[model samples]
Target: RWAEVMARFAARLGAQGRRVVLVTSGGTKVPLEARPVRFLDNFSSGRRGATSAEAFLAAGYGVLFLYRARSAFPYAHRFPPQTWLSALRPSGPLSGLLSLEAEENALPGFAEALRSYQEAAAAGTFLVVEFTTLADYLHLLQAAAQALNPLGPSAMFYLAAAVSDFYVPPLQITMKMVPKLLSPLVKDWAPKAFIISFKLETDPAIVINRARKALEIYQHQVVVANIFVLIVTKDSETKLLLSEEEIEKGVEIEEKIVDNLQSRHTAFI
Candidate 1:
């Protein structure tokens, strides 16, 4: 059932000559036991991934959103102004807020957002594939990359998952292994697709340098370098080693991130 829908969505996008992208969001858990009473995880809230997906969708790209289970989802990331239950109020003098219709109607901008969300969903521009564990994430990623391969140069990958460096796998502590895993597999499966790899480091000095090395090693299109603490803050000290020109222009960091990526993808084609 899932396979059929993905195949159809890819084919439809390809027929229209539109850009199609696979966006991986959130952090994967490394289970300590078979029944998994405990695990290792990361601080990724999936806000960046979900926001970028929305940007791509708005830009007319067909998106295959591969997100972690229970992570933020596109268009649904923004929550009620308060808690779900707190957002409810009495619909009438004596009525309980069970329906939620009155609250939804009263919330400012809710109607327009709801309409836009419904429209995009109905238009079939976005598809979601979710995962919970490291194995699930890796397997699904490989399959999705292969499935998207037929789209050729029009396909792109925006991998923003907060994978760990511990938990020995049949692998490279997550960070070290990603580029190795991605480069050859993608080269064989989707030889012409554009790839954007991300690197997050605490020190600003070493962040871009490491990203540069990744670009050399991975041989992918670009490596987006980010400062771990800065990005999650209000001022957004996030930096991109891909293009300094956009950085100096003083725009929203993600706006430039997407724009730079789109330009590179265009040049590839």
Candidate 2:
């Protein structure tokens, strides 16, 4: 389904039958309320995950974009000006950022984070499979895995989405929803998230090992693993462990990744 949707869009970009790189983000909120209440959540604005999505797109891969809680600044959709603003000076986001001091107070340090994110936006490439909940994240990931796993050839699934490892399963959901006010449309939403996991760890080693296990369980060609360390911005980075060497001796980022995709697809085919 995503491939069909992307195929139409790719016709516009002039890139078709190329590798599909899916990007997913945002933290999932596991509610604790019995009558539909807010639950546990991590400190993630989804900036890191969203930025990675943009970067992969810039690298020339067709993307399946997905992000959650993107309403927050660091991951908000306020950058790259939908259309050029002639009056605003174009030093990336600096010019418009100067005038938005009034809106900055709504959240602490959001302005600076916004500036940082704008710089990353220029590096995105992908068709997106957007969502905003733990269940939603897992369903999409599982769907992607299912889709790519059975492909005869010419398809790959990059599990780059940040899924909340935990969740609070709700007992009952309201049939009718009310406006504006969040109607107590929830039942005893007990924490029932440990069974089928979709979590990334803080340690790359741990995550790498976990990913290997995931590969075994899901039967994917490989997984692009990451951890919570992404919360902080830095020059030094954690290493990504690939199940197989997706890179070749003479290839670069775009080439190596695509080449690997091709080989994997051929094998599956």
Candidate 3:
């Protein structure tokens, strides 16, 4: 049934000479601990990505949603009212009409917070994928692009996920159970440090310059970047940046980050 919906939708899209859309969300993970597993992950909830996917589908475009399973992102829910009272007749007068509301369509994808992706196969306007680690994300990008090479005419990639720039691998490892002993493995940082670094300063020129270098290496057209002062502050919270010069004026911190992502979104677009 799911595939049928997708097949039919695909056929319709094909007739219109359209292809597919891909979306990546949530933040990449950093290996905080190794040997039995431990690591740090980005503090992204995949909420932004999920909302974007819904918006895309409503616009009649196919999409692919790739999200982190352990993300703290939230989902949208709806409540409908049912039943109605007759206005013309009083309670004793007459009971003629009954009003009821039907259940709204649920947002398809992972029902859970992380890695939850859903699509009604029929002519699905979007495709979703999942990833956890930075390496996985990188590999996925390359592979996804190659796989959809034949459909470039209608394909679009939305890299909305927060890709981590730093990674700390574990040093000590022991398969057998060996506890009761104090561990001294955390003496130094991970030896093989592989990072996807990101730097956004007060200067837009410098930001763009660095981004260009990343684009050259990764071959990606865009990267969402932001300044800490504009996003993560503890005091001031203003909606608009006003202008580039405004940033140089003061360093007012934002109380709550909320949904403001534009300080950097303008870069890739």
Candidate 4:
């Protein structure tokens, strides 16, 4: 069973005396019978979770990356579309990315990202588990939580997966509400883990209200309220941000979020 595999992964990390965080990303889709399912699309680009995984791994935390297929990947998400097109006369991506010649045309951090990814691989500190559907996401999540539970507060869940609020049933075809998995995840699956969830919304006013409501309902450690907001325990809100100058320097917000979260998780532990 996959849960058995998860347990072994957890056991390996535990035995190595490592702290672990699960970063979930991308969007969930309805299970269909050979058809194109659109309409209830997600707002997630998966960059938030992707960049955070790179941040967490760079911070020396063992990472379990749970993402949907075709979602953004850590270290590699820097390139948008053809940012690497000029860098490639590509054979194997491994060799192509390593070429110093390619670095001339590649983005500034291209080598850094590739190097980080390679180091994590060599260190055996990264595990990627992918899902293409909601059912699989839930199942894998349960397995991951079950495995990570033994770590208690050292297991951080950075839930950045974007799931549809409503879905049209497979053949049943009615617009149905997606099940709330957070409550069960916190209450039963991984009761002691430090959890953080995102509340990405278009409307500023409703986002904070909904973020607070999510916290009140789920009672999790933190809720990221919006692009520029994050809420911690006891209901305190923090707008930790990069100033205009910092933004001009191309600093990613996800890196700052991970920086803030590291100390936050330390306090929780």
Candidate 5:
């Protein structure tokens, strides 16, 4: 499954006219201690990519979700943690309605989430592939790009994964530079894909500058600079701001990100 997993989805998608998006999420681990495998890691639970996948599907794009194993899943992440067994009761007979935090589907947005998930599963519009190590990620990124090549401008790559800039080489413990893939991606693989890369920084001052630099260097259509999605190729930018009300309402910024991309991707084609 790991070697060539994208072909089935590529075959399934070719007949349909829906645009395709390759969403890469979660974090890659760097191996250090070989025996017990103590490691350096990137910080992410895959929330951004998980939520964005749902948003992209809602936007009617077929999704090839390449993510870290056991990270967040699209529709499933909106529910309560795995402790939901505590919310069930004796009302279970065979196939029956059940209670939730209070009653069946009592969780707000449950029906909408569940229905969308079921529809995607049934429609073959969504598929998931898993990766763990830096090498595995790189290998699959190439595979995914080639698989998506037929779609050309209909293809989109959202690199939301927090990949390490350095790695520990085999038989050595010191850090080595990780190969940068964006140039290769743009120049060779999936050249027509509207690539959306992200830049993360602890300080605000450097975030925009680095994202802008990446936009120019990588020549990708968009570089997400903190809260802003910079569409620098067109000299436009989208600012994502969450109001106090939106946070209370559980509105995610990814929804807006997907919304913007849907329009821009239309223009791209």
Candidate 6:
């Protein structure tokens, strides 16, 4: 299954000469009990990956969105923040509530989002692959990467998933060996693929250190390091390591990140 589906899509995108990105988002849960009543979880809504997927689609890149179950999705994530009734209004003589369809573009920002989503879907630029458990994530990740091998350097991997640090089976939890797989994954599955992994930590020092260490060990193309600290006011300030030119112009971090990846990908292709 999923492997076959991924292979088909990769072949189609390859034939069309479209660049493809595999974006993994959200967190994987580790079940503790046989019935799975208790599980370990991570704090991730998958908004970053969803937003990046939409950005890639807008930039005319084919996207293979591998996400956690029930997490945010491109375009669709906006609806969860607001109620459907909030967008409806009383209309006509009967005063019946006029339900606003998403495609109707009755509200601000809705039209553009809806249009972009529809266009991407219609053009077959976005393909969704979902997972909930650690096994599923790794299995699908391997399958998708292998299927994308033919695309070579044109295939980019944006690994943003918050992988579980431990697993309940204990037999399967091998933290020490997990990072080692990335090197072989590239060498055997997609050797020429552009890989970018993310490192998020509360301490800024640890984040940068771990990111650089990851590069040293995995030999990936890029590692996006970030310090995710929660402030007393419930607001957060994110800092990125970018070129001085981009910082001077006040470019959005995600845009700069994507643009940088795009430039590298172009060179690779």
Q: Candidate 4's error at 59, in angstroms?
A: 1.1
Taking all chains together, each candidate's TM-score versus the true structure is 0.76, 0.47, 0.48, 0.85, 0.85, 0.79
Each candidate's number of clashing pairs is 0, 18, 34, 0, 0, 0
lDDT of 3 by residue, 1-269 (tens): 33344345434554676544455678877665556266556677666566656555544555556677655322332111222122112324224765333222332232342222244345555554567887677666555544444443344455557666565544653332222111111111111111112233555555556555554544433333455323221222233343446546622221112123222222222
Top-scoring candidate (lDDT):
4
Best of the candidates, TM-score: 5
lDDT of each: 0.70, 0.42, 0.44, 0.78, 0.76, 0.73
- C-alpha RMSD values across all candidates: 6.9, 12.9, 13.6, 3.8, 3.4, 7.1
Q: What does candidate 4 score in Cα RMSD to the true structure?
A: 3.8
Q: What are the per-residue Cα lDDT tens digits for candidate 2 across 1-269?
A: 75455445434333444444444556655555667556566456655455555444545555556566453222344343432232243334454354422333344344565554454444333444666666665555555433333222333343334444445443553332223111111111111100112244557666566555554444444444335222111112233233335444322342333344444445444
Clashes of 1: 0
Task: Note the residue pairs that clash in candidate 4.
Answer: none
In model 4, the runs with Cα more than 4 Å from the true position are 32-40, 90-100, 168-173, 178-186, 202-205
Ranking by lDDT: 4, 5, 6, 1, 3, 2
Q: What is the lDDT of residue 71 in candidate 1?
A: 90
Q: Rank the candidates by TM-score, best first.
A: 5, 4, 6, 1, 3, 2
User: Which runs in model 1 stand beyond 4 Å of their true positions?
Assistant: 80-84, 88-109, 168-188, 202-205, 228-252
| Candidate 4 C-alpha error for residue 204, in Å | 5.7
lDDT tens digits, residue span 41-77, model 5: 7868999999999999998999999998878888777
- Candidate 3's displacement at residue 255, Å, is 24
Score candidate 1 by lDDT. 0.70
**Which 10-residue span in candidate 6 carries the lowest summed lDDT?**
228-237
* Alpha carbon lDDT at 218, candidate 2: 41
